[PDB]
Amino acid sequence: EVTSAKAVAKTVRIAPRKARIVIDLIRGKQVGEAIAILKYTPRSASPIIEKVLKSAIANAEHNYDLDINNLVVEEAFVDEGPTLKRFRPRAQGRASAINKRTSHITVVVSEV
Amino acid sequence: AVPFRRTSKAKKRKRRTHVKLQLPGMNECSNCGEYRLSHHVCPECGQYDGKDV
Amino acid sequence: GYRKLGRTSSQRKALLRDLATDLIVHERIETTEARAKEIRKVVEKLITSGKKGDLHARRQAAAFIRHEVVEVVQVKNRPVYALQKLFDDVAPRYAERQGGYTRILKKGPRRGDGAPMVIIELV
Amino acid sequence: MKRTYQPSKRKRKKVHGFRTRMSTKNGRRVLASRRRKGRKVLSA
Amino acid sequence: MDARDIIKRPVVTEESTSILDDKKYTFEVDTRATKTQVKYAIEEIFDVKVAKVNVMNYKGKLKRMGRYAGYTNKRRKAIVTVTADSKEIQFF
RNA sequence: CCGAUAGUGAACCAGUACCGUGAGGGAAAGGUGAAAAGCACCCCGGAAGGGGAGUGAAACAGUUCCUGAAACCGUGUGCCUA
RNA sequence: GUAUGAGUAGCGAAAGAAGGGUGAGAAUCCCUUCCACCGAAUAUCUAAGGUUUCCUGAGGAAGGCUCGUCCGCUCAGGGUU
Ligand SMILES: [Mg+2]
Ligand SMILES: [Mg+2]
Ligand SMILES: [Mg+2]
Ligand SMILES: [Mg+2]
Ligand SMILES: [Mg+2]
Ligand SMILES: [Mg+2]
Ligand SMILES: [Mg+2]
Ligand SMILES: [Mg+2]
Ligand SMILES: [Mg+2]
Ligand SMILES: [Mg+2]
Ligand SMILES: [Mg+2]
Ligand SMILES: [Mg+2]
Ligand SMILES: [Mg+2]
Ligand SMILES: [Mg+2]
Ligand SMILES: [Mg+2]
Ligand SMILES: [Mg+2]
Ligand SMILES: [Mg+2]
Ligand SMILES: [Mg+2]
Ligand SMILES: [Mg+2]
Ligand SMILES: [Mg+2]
Ligand SMILES: [Mg+2]
Ligand SMILES: [Mg+2]
Ligand SMILES: [Mg+2]
Ligand SMILES: [Mg+2]
Ligand SMILES: [Zn+2]
């Protein structure tokens, strides 16, 4: 007996600040409704977060044999990853820093 | 035109009170019984107003 | 009034003439919401010319329709143009209906730029 | 406008080339001191 | 050089084999071999009668295999055509 | 005497990469495990990446991989706050 | 090494539209029609200069101020008589 399952997507190219704004919608909701929210939210993080949630449900029934119809999104948070450092040539010979940030996305589903 | 003092953690968190985004106005389809947007063609069963489009 | 569509009075004139001809030829097209609320007026004002059947009405509608072939028939393979179809095929369909020859159905946002896309169709 | 470097294959070898360094006493001193550092390329 | 030192190996490609029926044979020769030496080297090895030889020089391609940069060998390619009243060379 | 910001500029393909027309200037970069035994097989996914299973003393040792501090970024909650 | 300014400035002169196709995924790739721009040039050659950027088959980690099924990018074979 485990009663919960999780899935992690590590070093996703999207920035942490742009992904936390979508996580805040699905936290604490049922997996049936949470999938629809990510489907009808026009942001670039919706496809990425939706595969993590779907993968968490997938091994919540193949590995631990739980009910798909009773799962809820217990936990969902975004961490940071290794950033890529780039440059942008500005005017008058100067250069400016650019941060290509990554993130870790973790979703935990469990019974109600 | 230049910040006099750096912004604290509390003041930077208070300002982001309103930078959230709202919940979509979705609805249950009458035919296929799954979620869709109001006043929109259902993307799954391809129907609107009970007639296929 | 009327809405400017992000382009000057010359681009806007050309944009409305291409979109109004495509709805005649294909009868069902994908556009954006604001771009479809505008050709909803230039197309129905164009069927009304086709419901007259005059030479004066035909010459007036010929100043808007683009000169492109809808399809080719062998009556002697002679092409058929968009102005012929409007006055001989599309207009006789609505000989009894007074107004509202088009309808709009909403689809959803577009991936590239979040634009709201709709179906505008000629029934 | 126009910049300070205008490339030319011939002009580069005639001023900085190996045979130009070997023709003078102080040009052979440049090669001697570049060999001392063990530089990959001597002259141009 | 010798006859076997001037000529190194044949070239077997789609372009090279598309002209074998035309009695044209593509070889890789020594980098310092003239057009005339290649003519007499072929007749010594294969005993064919040679009509023309055409040569061209290839540079070395800059190649990378991970943090290491270098060049491949530079080539000298010769195309030999023979008289119609002569035997053939079997690349096989 | 030093122990990877130290000790040669260089413990690693270093007078290298890079910078300059040129003379010339000149870096950063060490550590899986005793042994690759470097994850057969199954599931989600186009893949990356994960959850099991297995090897191992240890996988919270999984290809900047011993140990892993602080700044910085988050989730949950006991007391307070318009 | 990591913050604040902040999801703020910017995204570098310009006309695009629709219909098919491919694809896990298309405003951005391919095809078709219409429209628009240059035209003592934004057309055709050729020196200097650059050194494989040329062609074909695969690829989508990084580069491309967005996207990418695409590329002057990555890999493997070729090509200069
Ligand atoms: Mg400059
Ligand atoms: Mg004008
Ligand atoms: Mg001079
Ligand atoms: Mg030099
Ligand atoms: Mg020649
Ligand atoms: Mg040191
Ligand atoms: Mg140390
Ligand atoms: Mg140089
Ligand atoms: Mg695994
Ligand atoms: Mg895997
Ligand atoms: Mg395990
Ligand atoms: Mg064990
Ligand atoms: Mg040890
Ligand atoms: Mg560690
Ligand atoms: Mg810590
Ligand atoms: Mg401001
Ligand atoms: Mg502003
Ligand atoms: Mg631009
Ligand atoms: Mg040249
Ligand atoms: Mg090409
Ligand atoms: Mg990109
Ligand atoms: Mg593909
Ligand atoms: Mg390609
Ligand atoms: Mg290439
Ligand atoms: Zn439906």
Q: Could you please report the per-residue DSSP string of A8-35?
A: EEEEESS-HHHHHHHHHHHTTSBHHHHH
Between CA E55 and CA E78 the distance in angstroms is 4
Which of B13, B16, B46, B10 is CA-nearest to residue B31?
B46
Q: Which helix (H) or strand (E) holds C118?
A: strand C116-121
Q: Burial code of B16-40, b = ≥16 C-beta within 10 A, e = fewer?
A: eeeeeeeebebeebeeeebbbbeeb
Between CA E3 and CA A73 the distance in angstroms is 80
Q: Burial code of A35-55, b = ≥16 C-beta within 10 A, e = fewer?
A: bbbbbbbebebbebbbebbeb
Task: Give me the amino acid identity at A94.
Answer: R
Tokens of E37: 């030496």
Q: Are strands A71-80 and E75-82 parallel, antiparallel or unpaired?
A: unpaired
Residue with tokens 């961490």: A79
Strand, coil or helix: what is A104? strand
Q: Which helix (H) or strand (E) holds D30?
A: helix D25-36
**Which CATH number does A4-110 carry?**
3.90.470.10
Between CA B38 and CA B45 the distance in angstroms is 15
For residue C10, say whether its CB is under 7 Å from any atom of strand G. yes
Alpha helices in A1-112 (DSSP H): 16-26, 31-39, 45-62
Between CA A56 and CA A64 the distance in angstroms is 11
Tokens of A85: 């450092």
- Dmax (CA) for chain E in angstroms is 55
What is each CA distance from E53 to A96, B40, E6, E32, in whole angstroms? 59, 75, 14, 15
Point out which residues pair with A78 in neighbouring strands. Answer: A105
Contacting residues of C for B37, CB less than 8 Å apart: 106, 108
Angle made by CA atoms A75, A78, A84, in degrees to the nearest 5? 160
Contact call for residues C70 and C54 (beta carbons, < 8 A): no
Q: What is the Å distance from ligand 1's center to A93 Cα?
A: 5
The answer to whether the Cβ–Cβ distance between B39 and C106 falls below 8 Å is: yes
Chain A residues 35 to 94 whose Cβ lies within 7 Å of strand G are 80, 83-84, 86, 88-89
Residue with tokens 């942008």: A88
Task: Give me the amino acid identity at C111.
Answer: R
Contacting residues of B for C107, CB less than 8 Å apart: 40-41
Nearest chain C CA: its distance from A42 CA (Å): 7
Angle made by CA atoms E33, E37, E42, in degrees to the nearest 5? 115
How was this one solved? cryo-EM
Contact call for residues E35 and E55 (beta carbons, < 8 A): yes
Query: How many residues belong to chain C?
Result: 123
Between CA C38 and CA C28 the distance in angstroms is 15
Contact call for residues E77 and E56 (beta carbons, < 8 A): yes
Tokens of C55: 């030479």
B23 touches chain C (CB under 8 A): no
For residue E73, say whether its CB is under 7 Å from any atom of strand G. no
Order of strands across the sheet that contains E24-29? E7-10, E24-29, E75-82, E50-58
- Dmax (CA) for chain A in angstroms is 65
Of all residues in chain A, the one with the smallest CA distance to B35 is A36
> Residue B37: phi, psi to the nearest 5?
-85, 145
Rounded to 10 degrees, the C-alpha dihedral C77/C78/C84/C86 comes to 40
What is each CA distance from C66 to A93, C19, C60, C80, C81, in whole angstroms? 52, 10, 13, 13, 9
Chain A residues 32 to 71 whose Cβ lies within 7 Å of strand F are 51, 54-55, 58-59, 62-63
Query: How many residues belong to chain D?
Result: 44
Point out which residues pair with A106 in neighbouring strands. Answer: A8, A77
Domain residue ranges of chain D, discontinuous segments joined by +: 2-43
Rounded to 10 degrees, the C-alpha dihedral E11/E13/E18/E22 comes to 0
Q: What is the Å distance from ligand 24's center to E79 Cα?
A: 28
Which of A37, A24, A8, A38 is CA-nearest to residue A109?
A8
The answer to whether the Cβ–Cβ distance between B37 and A40 falls below 8 Å is: yes
Chain E residues 2 to 31 whose Cβ lies within 7 Å of strand G are 11, 13-16
Given CA atoms C7, C8, C11, C13 in this order, what sign does their dihedral have?
A: positive
Q: Is A56 exposed, middle or buried (0-12, 13-18, 19+ CB in 10 A)?
A: buried
Contact call for residues A76 and A23 (beta carbons, < 8 A): yes
Which of E28, E43, E27 is CA-nearest to residue E82?
E43
For residue D6, say whether its CB is under 7 Å from any atom of strand F. no
Tell me the CA–C1' distance in angstroms for A40 and G2: 36
Contact call for residues B35 and A36 (beta carbons, < 8 A): yes
Q: Are strands E69-71 and E62-64 parallel, antiparallel or unpaired?
A: antiparallel
Strand, coil or helix: what is C56? helix
Strand, coil or helix: what is B8? coil
Contacting residues of B for A19, CB less than 8 Å apart: none
Contact call for residues A43 and A94 (beta carbons, < 8 A): no
Residue C89 DSSP symbol: I
Work out the number of other CB atoms within 10 angstroms of the CB of residue C22.
Answer: 20
Which of A74, A55, A53 is CA-nearest to residue A3?
A74
Between CA E92 and CA E77 the distance in angstroms is 20
Contact call for residues C103 and C9 (beta carbons, < 8 A): no
What is each CA distance from C80 to C29, C56, C74, C76, in whole angstroms? 20, 21, 10, 12
The answer to whether the Cβ–Cβ distance between A33 and B35 falls below 8 Å is: yes
Q: Which residues contact A12 (CB under 8 A, 6 or more apart)?
A: A19, A48, A81, A102, A103, A104, A105
The answer to whether the Cβ–Cβ distance between C105 and B41 falls below 8 Å is: yes
Between CA D1 and CA C119 the distance in angstroms is 54
**Binding annotation of E:** 57
DSSP letters, B15-31, are HGGG---PPP-EEE-SS
Domain residue ranges of chain B, discontinuous segments joined by +: 2-53
The phi-psi region of residue E47 (left if phi > 0; otherwise alpha if psi is between -120 and 50; otherwise beta) is left
Covered bases, chain G (protein CB within 7 Å): 2-5, 7, 12, 15-19, 25-28, 33-36, 48-52, 61-67, 74-81
Which of E49, E48, E54 is CA-nearest to residue E29?
E54
Tokens of C45: 């004002």
Residue A93 DSSP symbol: G
Angle made by CA atoms C95, C99, C104, in degrees to the nearest 5? 115
Instruction: For chain A, positions 74-93, list CB contacts with chain C under 8 A.
Output: none
Work out the number of other CB atoms within 10 angstroms of the CB of residue D27.
Answer: 16
The answer to whether the Cβ–Cβ distance between B37 and C108 falls below 8 Å is: yes
